């Protein structure tokens, strides 16, 4: 599925990421933009081998199974095929536990490089919330 910018934020809202670890709402719709360009479906092969799934580009590594990273961590107890739904709501709940993890939402390079100390608030700027 691709969201529109503001459905998007509305779905981010209802699951309680607005405001999540001190992230206004706009960080996050900011992250997933360049992240995913809000496609569920976006999937991105990293050198290391793992890969990044979801409209938060979320990366099997650490945080989902996709039974093909060598040495990886599931620590958010999912397929990362949940990460490609419609529903948001495995993307948040995982996302929420990678933003917990110390470095806030700099474990996103795309959100520290792109996102990081922009006026982020345009991107929820008319939407009904
Ligand atoms: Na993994």
Not at 23 to 47: D, H, I, M, P
Not at 51 to 59: M, S, V
């Given at each position: 599925?691709?969201?529109?910018?503001?459905?998007?934020?509305?779905?981010?809202?209802?699951?309680?990421?607005?405001?999540?670890?001190?992230?206004?709402?706009?960080?996050?719709?900011?992250?997933?933009?360049?992240?995913?360009?809000?496609?569920?479906?976006?999937?991105?092969?990293?050198?290391?081998?793992?890969t990044?799934?979801?409209?938060?580009?979320?990366?099997?590594?650490?945080?989902?199974?996709?039974?093909?990273?060598?040495?990886?961590?599931?620590l958010?107890?999912?397929?990362?095929?949940?990460?490609?739904?419609?529903?948001?709501?495995?993307?948040?709940?995982?996302?929420?536990?990678?933003?917990?993890?110390?470095?806030?939402?700099?474990a996103?390079?795309?959100?520290?490089?792109?996102?990081?100390?922009?006026?982020?608030?345009?991107?929820?700027?008319?939407?009904?919330?």
């Amino acid at each position: 599925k691709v969201f529109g910018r503001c459905e998007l934020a509305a779905a981010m809202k209802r699951h309680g990421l607005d405001n999540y670890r001190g992230y206004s709402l706009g960080n996050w719709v900011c992250a997933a933009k360049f992240e995913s360009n809000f496609n569920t479906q976006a999937t991105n092969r990293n050198t290391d081998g793992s890969t990044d799934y979801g409209i938060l580009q979320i990366n099997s590594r650490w945080w989902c199974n996709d039974g093909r990273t060598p040495g990886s961590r599931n620590l958010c107890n999912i397929p990362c095929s949940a990460l490609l739904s419609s529903d948001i709501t495995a993307s948040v709940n995982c996302a929420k536990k990678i933003v917990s993890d110390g470095n806030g939402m700099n474990a996103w390079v795309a959100w520290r490089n792109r996102c990081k100390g922009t006026d982020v608030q345009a991107w929820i700027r008319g939407c009904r919330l």
